[PDB]
Curated annotation (Swiss-Prot):
Species: Mus musculus (Mouse)
Protein name (database record): Interferon-inducible protein AIM2
Induction remarks: By TGF-beta.
Subunit structure: Self-associates; forms homooligomers in response to cytosolic double-stranded DNA (dsDNA) and the dsDNA seems to serve as oligomerization platform. Component of AIM2 inflammasome, which consists of a signal sensor component (AIM2), an adapter (PYCARD/ASC), which recruits an effector pro-inflammatory caspase (CASP1). Interacts (via pyrin domain) with PYCARD/ASC (via pyrin domain); interaction is direct. Component of the AIM2 PANoptosome complex, a multiprotein complex that drives inflammatory cell death (PANoptosis). Interacts with EIF2AK2/PKR. Interacts with MAPRE1.
Function in brief: Sensor component of the AIM2 inflammasome, which mediates inflammasome activation in response to the presence of double-stranded DNA (dsDNA) in the cytosol, leading to subsequent pyroptosis. Inflammasomes are supramolecular complexes that assemble in the cytosol in response to pathogens and other damage-associated signals and play critical roles in innate immunity and inflammation. Acts as a recognition receptor (PRR): specifically recognizes and binds dsDNA in the cytosol, and mediates the formation of the inflammasome polymeric complex composed of AIM2, CASP1 and PYCARD/ASC. Also acts as a tumor suppressor independently of its role in inflammatory response. Able to suppress overt cell proliferation in enterocytes: restricts stem cell proliferation in the intestinal mucosa in an inflammasome-independent manner, contributing to a decrease in the likelihood of colorectal cancer development. AIM2 suppresses cell proliferation by inhibiting phosphorylation of AKT1 at 'Ser-473', preventing AKT1 activation and AKT-mTOR signaling pathway.
Highest taxon above the source species: Eukaryota
Changes after translation: Degraded via selective autophagy following interaction with TRIM11.
């Protein structure tokens, strides 16, 4: 489901980035949301996934999340994630 597309796509980067760079991602995407630093522990799966949904939406947020994450820490690694979006397209056409 869509939950798997957002959770996996996110943790893929959080588990590959450092704590120092992590502060940049949160500060870039979430400016007025000020995501809790303590939640960062499980933020990859639970917090970041559900959080962004409230800002713009499930698919909408994860979509732009790529452009931000790539241009900020690993524009090279993110390239692999954006490819998954293709298969995700048909995943949104089902219940």
């Amino acid at each position: 489901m869509e939950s798997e597309y957002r959770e996996m796509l996110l943790l893929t980067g959080l588990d590959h980035i450092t704590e120092e760079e992590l502060k940049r991602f949160k500060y870039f995407a979430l400016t007025e949301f000020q995501i809790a630093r303590s939640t960062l522990d499980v933020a990859d799966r639970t917090e970041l996934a559900d959080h962004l949904i409230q800002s713009a939406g499930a698919a909408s947020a994860v979509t732009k999340a790529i452009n931000i994450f790539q241009k900020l820490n690993y524009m090279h690694i993110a390239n692999a994630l954006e490819e998954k979006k293709k298969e995700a397209e048909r995943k949104l056409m089902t219940n």
